[PDB]
Design an enzyme around this catalytic site. Structure first.
Site, mmCIF file in Angstrom:
data_model
loop_
_atom_site.group_PDB
_atom_site.id
_atom_site.type_symbol
_atom_site.label_atom_id
_atom_site.label_comp_id
_atom_site.label_asym_id
_atom_site.label_seq_id
_atom_site.Cartn_x
_atom_site.Cartn_y
_atom_site.Cartn_z
ATOM 1 N N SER A 20 2.463 -19.075 52.083
ATOM 2 C CA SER A 20 3.672 -18.685 52.780
ATOM 3 C C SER A 20 4.638 -18.076 51.783
ATOM 4 C CB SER A 20 4.319 -19.872 53.455
ATOM 5 O OG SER A 20 4.900 -20.724 52.506
ATOM 6 N N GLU A 76 -0.864 -25.228 63.542
ATOM 7 C CA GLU A 76 0.489 -24.956 63.994
ATOM 8 C C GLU A 76 0.710 -23.666 64.783
ATOM 9 O OE1 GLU A 76 2.844 -24.439 60.537
ATOM 10 O OE2 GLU A 76 1.630 -22.885 59.745
ATOM 11 N N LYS A 133 -10.190 -12.759 45.990
ATOM 12 C CA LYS A 133 -10.982 -13.655 46.808
ATOM 13 C C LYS A 133 -10.214 -14.380 47.917
ATOM 14 C CE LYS A 133 -14.645 -14.193 46.596
ATOM 15 N NZ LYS A 133 -15.740 -13.545 47.368
ATOM 16 N N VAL A 189 9.783 -6.339 44.333
ATOM 17 C CA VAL A 189 10.891 -5.449 44.009
ATOM 18 C C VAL A 189 12.209 -6.207 43.984
ATOM 19 C CG1 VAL A 189 9.734 -3.461 45.027
ATOM 20 C CG2 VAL A 189 11.275 -4.855 46.414
ATOM 21 N N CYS A 238 35.368 -19.181 59.381
ATOM 22 C CA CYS A 238 35.199 -20.342 60.258
ATOM 23 C C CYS A 238 35.828 -21.558 59.589
ATOM 24 C CB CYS A 238 33.724 -20.561 60.591
ATOM 25 S SG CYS A 238 33.406 -21.879 61.799
ATOM 26 N N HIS A 276 32.511 -14.362 62.679
ATOM 27 C CA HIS A 276 31.467 -14.240 61.683
ATOM 28 C C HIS A 276 31.070 -12.817 61.349
ATOM 29 C CE1 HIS A 276 30.641 -18.457 61.899
ATOM 30 N NE2 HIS A 276 30.622 -18.372 63.218
ATOM 31 N N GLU A 297 29.798 -11.664 58.794
ATOM 32 C CA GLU A 297 28.545 -11.627 58.071
ATOM 33 C C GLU A 297 27.340 -11.330 58.960
ATOM 34 O OE1 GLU A 297 30.287 -14.327 58.604
ATOM 35 O OE2 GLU A 297 29.086 -15.971 59.218
HETATM 36 N N1 LIG Z 1 -4.444 -27.729 58.746
HETATM 37 C C1 LIG Z 1 -3.131 -27.896 58.916
HETATM 38 C C2 LIG Z 1 -2.364 -28.436 57.874
HETATM 39 C C3 LIG Z 1 -1.021 -28.161 57.769
HETATM 40 N N2 LIG Z 1 -0.432 -27.483 58.802
HETATM 41 C C4 LIG Z 1 0.902 -26.903 58.619
HETATM 42 O O1 LIG Z 1 1.008 -26.836 57.170
HETATM 43 C C5 LIG Z 1 2.385 -26.535 56.921
HETATM 44 C C6 LIG Z 1 2.787 -26.944 55.490
HETATM 45 O O2 LIG Z 1 2.585 -25.858 54.630
HETATM 46 P P1 LIG Z 1 3.749 -24.792 54.357
HETATM 47 O O3 LIG Z 1 4.530 -24.482 55.582
HETATM 48 O O4 LIG Z 1 3.212 -23.665 53.567
HETATM 49 O O5 LIG Z 1 4.776 -25.666 53.472
HETATM 50 P P2 LIG Z 1 4.539 -27.186 52.861
HETATM 51 O O6 LIG Z 1 4.115 -28.153 53.902
HETATM 52 O O7 LIG Z 1 5.645 -27.593 51.979
HETATM 53 O O8 LIG Z 1 3.226 -26.914 51.962
HETATM 54 P P3 LIG Z 1 2.678 -25.405 51.515
HETATM 55 O O9 LIG Z 1 3.737 -24.392 51.311
HETATM 56 O O10 LIG Z 1 1.840 -25.659 50.167
HETATM 57 O O11 LIG Z 1 1.596 -24.993 52.629
HETATM 58 C C7 LIG Z 1 3.126 -27.376 57.947
HETATM 59 O O12 LIG Z 1 4.133 -26.586 58.563
HETATM 60 C C8 LIG Z 1 2.061 -27.754 58.990
HETATM 61 O O13 LIG Z 1 2.518 -27.397 60.298
HETATM 62 C C9 LIG Z 1 -1.145 -27.218 60.015
HETATM 63 O O14 LIG Z 1 -0.582 -26.687 60.963
HETATM 64 N N3 LIG Z 1 -2.507 -27.261 59.987
HETATM 65 N N1 LIG Z 2 -18.807 -13.798 50.935
HETATM 66 C C1 LIG Z 2 -19.337 -13.243 49.843
HETATM 67 C C2 LIG Z 2 -18.705 -12.140 49.250
HETATM 68 C C3 LIG Z 2 -18.857 -11.873 47.911
HETATM 69 N N2 LIG Z 2 -19.652 -12.722 47.190
HETATM 70 C C4 LIG Z 2 -19.415 -12.882 45.749
HETATM 71 O O1 LIG Z 2 -18.028 -12.458 45.598
HETATM 72 C C5 LIG Z 2 -17.836 -12.362 44.181
HETATM 73 C C6 LIG Z 2 -16.651 -11.436 43.843
HETATM 74 O O2 LIG Z 2 -15.644 -12.200 43.242
HETATM 75 P P1 LIG Z 2 -15.752 -12.647 41.707
HETATM 76 O O3 LIG Z 2 -17.139 -13.017 41.322
HETATM 77 O O4 LIG Z 2 -14.660 -13.589 41.394
HETATM 78 O O5 LIG Z 2 -15.520 -11.237 40.961
HETATM 79 P P2 LIG Z 2 -15.355 -9.749 41.664
HETATM 80 O O6 LIG Z 2 -16.507 -9.407 42.532
HETATM 81 O O7 LIG Z 2 -14.923 -8.735 40.690
HETATM 82 O O8 LIG Z 2 -14.130 -10.058 42.673
HETATM 83 P P3 LIG Z 2 -13.084 -11.352 42.546
HETATM 84 O O9 LIG Z 2 -12.848 -11.829 41.164
HETATM 85 O O10 LIG Z 2 -11.721 -10.845 43.230
HETATM 86 O O11 LIG Z 2 -13.673 -12.483 43.522
HETATM 87 C C7 LIG Z 2 -19.146 -11.784 43.666
HETATM 88 O O12 LIG Z 2 -19.597 -12.562 42.565
HETATM 89 C C8 LIG Z 2 -20.127 -11.944 44.841
HETATM 90 O O13 LIG Z 2 -21.342 -12.545 44.386
HETATM 91 C C9 LIG Z 2 -20.574 -13.598 47.854
HETATM 92 O O14 LIG Z 2 -21.450 -14.189 47.236
HETATM 93 N N3 LIG Z 2 -20.319 -13.942 49.148
HETATM 94 N N1 LIG Z 3 8.151 -7.404 47.667
HETATM 95 C C1 LIG Z 3 9.283 -8.109 47.655
HETATM 96 N N2 LIG Z 3 9.879 -8.303 46.469
HETATM 97 C C2 LIG Z 3 10.255 -9.547 46.180
HETATM 98 N N3 LIG Z 3 10.277 -10.608 46.984
HETATM 99 C C3 LIG Z 3 10.103 -10.236 48.259
HETATM 100 C C4 LIG Z 3 9.645 -8.998 48.681
HETATM 101 N N4 LIG Z 3 9.352 -9.038 50.030
HETATM 102 C C5 LIG Z 3 9.340 -10.319 50.287
HETATM 103 N N5 LIG Z 3 9.983 -11.069 49.348
HETATM 104 C C6 LIG Z 3 10.684 -12.354 49.287
HETATM 105 O O1 LIG Z 3 10.255 -13.105 50.395
HETATM 106 C C7 LIG Z 3 11.247 -14.106 50.718
HETATM 107 C C8 LIG Z 3 11.384 -14.217 52.226
HETATM 108 O O2 LIG Z 3 11.551 -15.578 52.577
HETATM 109 P P1 LIG Z 3 11.119 -16.120 53.893
HETATM 110 O O3 LIG Z 3 12.164 -15.896 54.943
HETATM 111 O O4 LIG Z 3 10.655 -17.522 53.694
HETATM 112 O O5 LIG Z 3 9.813 -15.183 54.138
HETATM 113 P P2 LIG Z 3 8.941 -15.164 55.511
HETATM 114 O O6 LIG Z 3 9.532 -14.005 56.259
HETATM 115 O O7 LIG Z 3 7.563 -14.874 54.995
HETATM 116 O O8 LIG Z 3 9.155 -16.510 56.123
HETATM 117 C C9 LIG Z 3 12.519 -13.690 49.972
HETATM 118 O O9 LIG Z 3 12.845 -14.614 48.923
HETATM 119 C C10 LIG Z 3 12.202 -12.300 49.428
HETATM 120 O O10 LIG Z 3 12.841 -12.077 48.189
#
Ligand SMILES: Nc1ccn([C@@H]2O[C@H](COP(=O)(O)OP(=O)(O)OP(=O)(O)O)[C@@H](O)[C@H]2O)c(=O)n1
Ligand SMILES: Nc1ccn([C@@H]2O[C@H](COP(=O)(O)OP(=O)(O)OP(=O)(O)O)[C@@H](O)[C@H]2O)c(=O)n1
Ligand SMILES: Nc1ncnc2c1ncn2[C@@H]1O[C@H](COP(=O)(O)OP(=O)(O)O)[C@@H](O)[C@H]1O
Ligand SMILES: Nc1ccn([C@@H]2O[C@H](COP(=O)(O)OP(=O)(O)OP(=O)(O)O)[C@@H](O)[C@H]2O)c(=O)n1
Ligand SMILES: Nc1ccn([C@@H]2O[C@H](COP(=O)(O)OP(=O)(O)OP(=O)(O)O)[C@@H](O)[C@H]2O)c(=O)n1
Ligand SMILES: Nc1ncnc2c1ncn2[C@@H]1O[C@H](COP(=O)(O)OP(=O)(O)O)[C@@H](O)[C@H]1O
Ligand SMILES: Nc1ncnc2c1ncn2[C@@H]1O[C@H](COP(=O)(O)OP(=O)(O)O)[C@@H](O)[C@H]1O
Lengths: 534, 534, 534
Positions: free
Chosen positions: A14, A149, A189, A241, A379, A505, A507
């Site tokens: 995220s 979710e 990947k 950026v 406000c 507001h 803003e």
């Molecule tokens: N398989 C799962 C596990 C988690 N969640 C969602 O995972 C989110 C949590 O991840 P995120 O929103 O990205 O923030 P954090 O919970 O702090 O953790 P992180 O950013 O590492 O995902 C929660 O909103 C929850 O709804 C879900 O819907 N399905």
């Molecule tokens: N679902 C898939 C797709 C690709 N590959 C593996 O995907 C890898 C590609 O990733 P990596 O080995 O880490 O190096 P690159 O191919 O250059 O790409 P990247 O590092 O981004 O994964 C290759 O080894 C390939 O064998 C695979 O086995 N199964």
């Molecule tokens: N390419 C960009 N350069 C730097 N950060 C960016 C750019 N576009 C996205 N972001 C960052 O993404 C964040 C947006 O936050 P948030 O509202 O949580 O995102 P989302 O819309 O994914 O929920 C900001 O902190 C903003 O600076």
């Protein structure tokens, strides 16, 4: 005329800026002469954002129609000229509330209410509602792909893609192509897997967005194209950026919008993005610098005052001046004192809820007022300034709001029903854009160059009126009043270099292209003061 | 005594250091007095690594028994004393070759040969073979989880685990916890999905390794623990460090080994990691520094000379001196010339294959020799030095090797069968650890402090005895001869401060704790020269 | 004492009989002397089952405490002597209603309400509530594995499995091992994938149930065991049978319960299943047979009258007589006429809501009454019979219910408030088990052998006592009345061989082991009549 839709999802991690990316695109589509709009779907159980704190999600956006909504709706306002409404944003909880109410009313005639159909139908109908009458509708899907979710929403989309036809819909997807310094290179990947996840739920991506801290090499983009069943030209790189207003330029640079019009068979004129190019030029080439200190409560999370921060920025853009923001906890001014407020060119006091260190906010208001330091109140900040002035100029010892002290004995702020004087003699909530009567002789009237002005509101308590006459007669200018009840919308201090405080507001109305008179004046005043203090 | 196994897998992105983590663990287990060994399975069609270039994968490790194997086997040699063999590493292609051969000769008696069970049988039998007689066996699975390249291996493991019981097996899984500066925080979502992927193929992780550029907060580790069905104490954080030799300390710090012995019901003695603590102290507190220049070909990917780089580092550790390696392309010395070789305290020339700018390598050998700049030549570097000396001192015009110029006229290097003189009169590959008779009066004999030594080999052409007598008589010391054929294993220059070159590969024996005589000598000489020039 | 839990899931296809399997297990564990209870989680959005029709899900079970719930709760009553309550079954919609209401009340203090953790906590709490104080808690998970409709529940479970500990929880999973006649064999592939799906969401099965129309070969069970990481002994085969009361025998035969007690370290006494064996014996060895007509409305879906059907079966078990139910559409009685009712030994009229063929129902009641054919009326059937007698014997032209006709003129059924006579002079829903006063001189008092009884109710309208005296004095026996207002509960016909009708729902109390006096008498009467007519 048939409405075209583009869905925006994100996977891997995220915080990629889905709303930002979508808004930037919309700006371009606007620049191509297209009727583009945008909606956001949330994965939250909360029905309304009003039940959550600003520390939890940041500032809650106020729409024209008074609806409270997701912060990103304000972000949409900062890219396109259309108006967001209650139809542009809703949550999961909202859906259930509605559906369960329909259940209760017998609207399903004894049938089983399932996720499929019924729940997804509710979603589909809401999307069609909001997109009605538009050429292009962007739909941001909250949540992360692969998480439970938001699977119902993803499903509703799939259904609509089939129902509508692929000739009127595109799948856009944001990913992360993280840089691994240990290897000295970025990896693709995670992206490959994100796409696979979409596919497993019936979705084949058409456009890919590669978020990173640096441009992704064409070779890597090609590798992605291969594994995702996507044309190389549809794999867009998006490096970090220092300004969101530069993104439209980047998207345009890579031909994203051309691809889109081609897919929708649209005859789209060359995008006029010069409006933002101007903004960028000005942004990157300020002639001055000012420091504004902001005293508040939720400063531990900038998002809580996001709309304000951006409004300050917009004022700075028009005055070609850099804006520094000092984050000050009102409780520290309360504790440590006004020493915190030193080294500032201007003082900013935002709105919000909670007593907390409001006495430090009052202390600050007093500091800025007494020392003639460019002051802006919004406000609650206005209410604070009201109290400050009242206690020390109008001599209304213990002036306060009834919401904190039932018997202030000097209730400068109270509900209309609660209006009363210091002797106990007496006589819901205001939201959305409302017309205010500006006083022709006030600065604000001249700042807007108009007798009246329409500005957004979000608040329950009002200026007493019974005791107002003490405050106003003591030497305070009411710069503008409301409508039917002529409520003190905005005030100005007679001999202060620049002191403005209001109920509305501003803003939520400022833009990067237009700015906003009050922030223009405030920031300018900061500069003036700065130069005077030298 | 029943053998216990721990499997190592990795998801999200590659290049997390699976071999590093495994080796570090094994080091600890050895430090606790346990009979630990290690094997690596490789997801490649290549049967032998000898069919691939140095630039493709880096250096190919030479085992004691002469087997060509994955570089990481050398890494294993640098952490544990258990010796690796051909049984410690094999590929997907190797498996197929074996199985298809068995098919061909009727070993499956008319049955269908299938991945399941026949390919998995080949795999699990090889695993049991290598793990014979050991307390703990680490098995590293190459490739990335979720990719088809290694699913057969993962399946073989699942089956095995069930067969041997959970009391004899643990699953360690590496992940990536990326830092997102834009958000100002690390993310865990990718990890959660990686684990889910293993689960989908029948594998439940027991231990998690969180790779990152910084310590992961306990809170985040707890969040992971929740979603992965793993105890909080089994979620290990592993931030980036400036030395692999510090990893055992970190793993020990988090109680990893204690957990493991508890899981295997072993009464394991407290790990003695002081050997590495010593190394770390010395590494982080060198008394000096020295610039070593290296001239070669595969410098575009340091992995090609990884074993050499490590060996140089080890010499530096013993002499408490920082080793600064300059990467020089032989073709640039060929083009630009010896100006490249200026500013060096010592010069080193590695082995390898390919003519390329080897003439520049020869020029370099000449340069270091004639200017009395400490010099170390390995395999090809010896061949180079041989030609240098022969052509410019022994006057052997066009001294060369038949592997590049069969019609040399002064083939100083040639196949033993191909040995010949300039008048045309005459008279496979040497691999693995072989005994070399050192000349008692040579420096190298005294550097090792032994009549003979045993060192690893890999080369096809030998010093041409037909012409050797010209070279040696011209004034070159043969510091040691092989055995049966008394082949010139190593030479020293009579009046050069420190010029040593050899056929064997000392870099496959050097360790961070034991060091190695030739690198101790080379690096020391390098420092001495530096001081002599200052 | 610590509560142990077993979760029951199923995949591949629906309609496997998850509740049946769970109930049969519970019966065994009851027979092992354990404090067993059971709950079912309902994936539906409907809050209450009362908002759905009988045709939608069949009969709705009435619990002792008046709660309306899933039909399977009645199925649980037919395998274990413990009592179900509102705590034993709730829906997805119910959860959201509760959570959203908590939100509204500020229960989450400004926090984001999310599926994880808030919705899952609601679930977790409800599970712990229902399982409190029990040794073994079976939890049936509705929906199909892999569908989004129940993933939240599956997640809540996973979490609890971890928090509680594996020593107190097991995963049971139903599959389909379909027979492919074209190949001449059953397939296991579907099962393998079903298990993989659970694994992908953090769940590893412990016990497998192979549903099919035939015993699954040990070899196939072994193949499954392999691919699923499950011991062969834990792979249970479950072929289709002609009686659900034979299932405890099968599960016992394969040692399922022993496995379970070993997993929970329970010293469980040998199951006494002889009570079920008795039932089976009697079921499979009736001495006679009778045909009973069932005139109603929802006969197109047997499930609508499931509880009634089973109650009839139980009466037949006690009298060793086969029960042949003829489903009759009351609307056809209106069309075709009483010819439908010929060839029957007894007549039965079930309860329900809606007019539809009610006049035909009356015609049938008349037919059975006037022709002396063993009649049993329940709820609506009683209302119908009341009208029949009233109109055709007490001369109450258009005797009717106010639920269908605002001005019946002879409202024999009405709300208590609505009670009135034919001259217009006057003067929610009864749910759950309620005490009824039986008339000592009535047949049913003697059938029950008790002054009073307690039976379940589900209706809003009552016998209009304003006109009762007309009906009763005309020659009709009130066999029982209720409580405070002595509402008419049971009616008997003075000279009919066996004609009774009642307000309560005896079909929710009848069991296979205890039977039920009423149905015993009814079915017996059918036989008596059959012989009478032969
Ligand atoms: N398989 C799962 C596990 C988690 N969640 C969602 O995972 C989110 C949590 O991840 P995120 O929103 O990205 O923030 P954090 O919970 O702090 O953790 P992180 O950013 O590492 O995902 C929660 O909103 C929850 O709804 C879900 O819907 N399905
Ligand atoms: N679902 C898939 C797709 C690709 N590959 C593996 O995907 C890898 C590609 O990733 P990596 O080995 O880490 O190096 P690159 O191919 O250059 O790409 P990247 O590092 O981004 O994964 C290759 O080894 C390939 O064998 C695979 O086995 N199964
Ligand atoms: N390419 C960009 N350069 C730097 N950060 C960016 C750019 N576009 C996205 N972001 C960052 O993404 C964040 C947006 O936050 P948030 O509202 O949580 O995102 P989302 O819309 O994914 O929920 C900001 O902190 C903003 O600076
Ligand atoms: N990927 C999907 C698809 C379907 N549903 C749910 O699937 C259920 C329907 O499947 P089922 O009960 O099996 O009956 P039918 O839909 O009639 O189809 P079938 O029996 O063949 O599955 C619905 O409740 C719907 O909400 C869902 O949760 N996830
Ligand atoms: N995830 C797995 C598991 C099994 N197999 C394949 O599973 C097949 C076995 O199933 P099938 O061919 O249908 O016949 P049987 O093995 O007898 O079992 P079944 O028919 O029930 O699948 C084998 O060919 C094997 O290659 C595989 O490739 N991948
Ligand atoms: N925590 C660590 N600190 C810094 N980098 C490390 C650490 N562990 C892993 N690495 C890096 O990982 C790389 C290992 O490369 P490679 O042989 O491709 O790993 P793998 O064993 O995963 O194939 C090295 O460059 C090494 O520096
Ligand atoms: N092995 C068995 N023999 C025959 N059918 C059975 C057996 N176990 C389950 N069933 C059948 O399963 C069906 C249960 O239907 P239903 O209540 O829809 O299933 P579920 O409770 O799984 O949704 C019944 O028709 C019953 O006959």
């Amino acid at each position: 005329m048939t409405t075209n839709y583009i869905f925006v999802t994100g996977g891997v991690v995220s915080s990629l800026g889905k709303g930002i990316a979508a808004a930037s695109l919309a700006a371009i589509l606007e620049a191509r002469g297209l009727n583009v709009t945008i909606m956001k779907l949330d994965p939250y159980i909360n029905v309304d954002p009003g039940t959550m704190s600003p520390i939890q999600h940041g500032e809650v956006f106020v729409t024209e129609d008074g609806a409270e909504t997701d912060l990103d709706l304000g972000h949409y306002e900062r890219f396109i000229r259309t108006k967001m409404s209650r139809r542009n944003n809703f949550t999961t909880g909202r859906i259930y509330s509605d559906v369960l109410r329909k259940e209760r009313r017998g609207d399903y005639l004894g049938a089983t209410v399932q996720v499929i159909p019924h729940i997804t139908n509710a979603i589909k109908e809401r999307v069609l509602e909001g997109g009605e009458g538009h050429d292009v509708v962007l739909v941001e899907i909250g949540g992360t792909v692969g998480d439970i979710e938001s699977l119902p929403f993803l499903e509703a989309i799939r259904q609509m893609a089939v129902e509508i036809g692929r000739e009127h819909t595109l799948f856009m997807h944001l990913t992360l192509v993280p840089y691994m310094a240990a290897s000295g290179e970025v990896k693709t990947k995670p992206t490959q897997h994100s796409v696979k996840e979409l596919l497993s739920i019936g979705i084949q991506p058409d456009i890919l967005i590669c978020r990173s801290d640096r441009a992704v090499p064409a070779n890597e983009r090609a590798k992605i194209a291969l594994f995702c069943n996507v044309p190389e030209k549809a794999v867009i790189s998006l490096k970090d950026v220092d300004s969101i207003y530069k993104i439209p330029g980047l998207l345009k640079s890579q031909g994203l919008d051309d691809y889109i019009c081609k897919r929708f068979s649209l005859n789209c004129p060359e995008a006029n993005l010069s409006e933002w190019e101007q903004v960028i030029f000005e942004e990157a080439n300020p002639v001055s610098e000012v420091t504004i200190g902001m005293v508040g409560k939720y400063i531990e999370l900038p998002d809580a005052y996001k709309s304000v921060i951006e409004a300050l920025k917009h004022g700075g853009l028009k005055n070609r001046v850099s804006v520094n923001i000092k984050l000050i906890d009102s409780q520290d001014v309360e504790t440590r004192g006004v020493e915190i407020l030193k080294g500032l060119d201007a003082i900013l006091v935002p709105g919000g809820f909670g007593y907390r260190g409001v006495e430090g906010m009052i202390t600050t208001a007093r500091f800025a007022r007494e020392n003639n330091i460019p002051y802006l109140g919004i406000c609650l900040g206005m209410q604070v300034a009201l109290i400050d002035y009242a206690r020390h100029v109008a001599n209304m010892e213990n002036a306060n709001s009834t919401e904190f002290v039932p018997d202030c004995k000097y209730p400068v702020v109270a509900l209309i029903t609660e209006w009363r004087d210091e002797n106990g003699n007496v006589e819901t909530m205001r939201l959305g854009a409302q017309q205010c009567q500006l006083v022709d002789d006030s600065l604000v009237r001249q700042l807007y160059n108009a007798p009246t002005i329409v500005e957004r509101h979000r608040h329950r308590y009002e200026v007493n009126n019974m005791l107002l006459k003490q405050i106003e007669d003591a030497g305070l200018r009411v710069a503008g009043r409301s409508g039917d009840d002529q409520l003190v919308e905005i005030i100005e201090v007679p001999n202060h270099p620049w002191f403005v405080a209001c109920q509305f507001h501003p803003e939520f109305t400022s833009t990067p292209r237009d700015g906003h008179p009050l922030f223009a004046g405030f920031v300018k005043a900061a500069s003036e003061f700065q130069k005077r203090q030298a």
